[PDB]
């Protein structure tokens, strides 16, 4: 069985943990629980293939930022999450992408851009602005809501497909 090593990154409170728990455990609770570092594993079927997902759920808090230079070395693909009601989290995205490329010494790291909290009405990041950024990077962009679960499968499975293609060279 193939195993895909996924890492979820992004700013405080954007929904990294909520997305991950929805994918793995199929539930959502509005609760305060800042992450240091959590790890999950689940066997799934993607595009008819059985595989193993290993997901590292990382800290948004800058107090733990020194950990990045380490966990970035062993991730195969990265879900870069911002929240559509949090402009600063969208501005952070390019810093995560630049660090991932630096640590891996590669201009071609599997990545998917995720705009989360799409259930909210108080939007401050334009969808077309996110689509343009992702196009300039050459990566997919998916709008998600951990609260309604819209787009959760698509985001993680699209990352797996990107990794699969990178591995196939």
């Amino acid at each position: 069985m193939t195993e895909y090593k996924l890492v979820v990154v992004g700013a405080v409170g954007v929904g990294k943990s909520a997305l991950t728990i929805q994918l793995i455990q199929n539930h959502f609770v509005d609760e305060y629980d800042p992450t240091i570092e959590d790890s999950y594993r689940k066997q799934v079927v993607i595009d008819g293939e059985t595989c193993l997902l290993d997901i590292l759920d990382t800290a948004g808090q800058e107090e733990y930022s020194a950990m990045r230079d380490q966990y970035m070395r062993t991730g195969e693909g990265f879900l870069c999450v911002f929240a559509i009601n949090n402009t600063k989290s969208f501005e952070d995205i390019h810093h995560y992408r630049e660090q991932i490329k630096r640590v891996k010494d590669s201009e071609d790291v599997p990545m998917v851009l995720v705009g989360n909290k799409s259930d909210l009405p108080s939007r401050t990041v334009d969808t077309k602005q996110a689509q343009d950024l992702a196009r300039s990077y050459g990566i997919p962009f998916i709008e998600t809501s951990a609260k309604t679960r819209q787009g959760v499968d698509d985001a993680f499975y699209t990352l797996v497909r990107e990794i699969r293609k990178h591995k196939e060279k």
């Binding site: 793995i24 629980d33 240091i36 570092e37 959590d38 790890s39 999950y40 594993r41």
Partner: protein, 86 residues
């Protein structure tokens, strides 16, 4: 002083571990309370739970409930490598 510790539960729920902060003055009941909060066991009696350090696959070390955890745990730092033929 402080350090990060990885906490796992035996529920086969897809979680491998969740990390929490450990401090040099933490005694075992406090760490148990923090671990249960982290794994959503806060409504359950802490006295029913114990804190066990995993040293290797076959080696474990139960922290007694009266102990300062920094002092009672094995704090040895190990890095593992394979010498592999190409």
């Amino acid at each position: 002083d402080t350090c990060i510790i990885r906490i796992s539960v035996e529920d086969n729920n897809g979680n491998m571990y969740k990390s929490i902060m450990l401090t040099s003055q933490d005694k075992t009941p406090a760490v148990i309370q923090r671990a249960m909060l982290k794994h959503n066991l806060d409504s359950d009696p802490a006295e029913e739970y114990e804190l066990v350090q995993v040293i290797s696959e076959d080696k474990e070390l139960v922290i007694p409930d009266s102990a300062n955890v920094f002092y009672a745990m094995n704090s040895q730092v190990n890095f593992d490598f394979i010498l592999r033929k190409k």
